[PDB]
Amino acid sequence: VNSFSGYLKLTDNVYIKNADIVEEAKKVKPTVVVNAANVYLKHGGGVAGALNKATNNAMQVESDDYIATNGPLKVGGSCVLSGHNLAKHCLHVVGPNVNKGEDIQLLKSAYENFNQHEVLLAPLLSAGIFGADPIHSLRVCVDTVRTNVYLAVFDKNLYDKLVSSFL
Ligand SMILES: OCc1nc2ncc(Br)cc2[nH]1
């Protein structure tokens, strides 16, 4: 039993809600919140900009130190950093950005990072400003993630379409 509330169950391990991931993180304080990161951990907009803003820029400060030490992530890769006031940990996951020409096949590799954590609150990777079809992202999520994932979808219209079209 966990504290996530109001999710629709899609499969044995995948759940979904029409919610702002920031507000959902602040309320649940999950062990792991997933950020829709880019390789530079520059949290400017989309989900990353919103998460970082909610940490009063502390996420960005931590991220800049991480990059200065380690260099950029790989597309499809991830790193675990602090969750600040939102969660115990933040799993920064880089899905391919379609508006950068990156191979959508890397979406499965991106979701594989979720399997290193027993429970996660997450957005749909590569959705929104990353330019991929959120319906396809949900399909890859369900077919790749085996751990317990709670998906927050900001847009109600999108949330309703994802549910109604789910196979
Ligand atoms: O909590 C305020 C907020 N702003 C946001 N912008 C984009 C996304 Br996705 C989620 C957001 N949550």
Curated annotation (Swiss-Prot):
Effect on the protein upon substituting residue 164 to L: In strain: Gamma/P.1
Task of the protein: Responsible for the cleavages located at the N-terminus of the replicase polyprotein. Participates together with nsp4 in the assembly of virally-induced cytoplasmic double-membrane vesicles necessary for viral replication. Antagonizes innate immune induction of type I interferon by blocking the phosphorylation, dimerization and subsequent nuclear translocation of host IRF3. Also prevents host NF-kappa-B signaling. In addition, PL-PRO possesses a deubiquitinating/deISGylating activity and processes both 'Lys-48'- and 'Lys-63'-linked polyubiquitin chains from cellular substrates.
Topological type in the membrane: Multi-pass membrane protein
Protein name per Swiss-Prot or TrEMBL: Papain-like protease nsp3
Activity regulation as described: Inhibited in vitro by GRL-0617.
Impact when changing residue 31 to A: In strain: Mu/B.1.621
Catalytic reactions on record: Thiol-dependent hydrolysis of ester, thioester, amide, peptide and isopeptide bonds formed by the C-terminal Gly of ubiquitin (a 76-residue protein attached to proteins as an intracellular targeting signal)
Domain Macro: 1-167
Assembly and oligomerization: May form homohexamers. Interacts with N protein.
Compartment(s) of residence: Host endoplasmic reticulum membrane
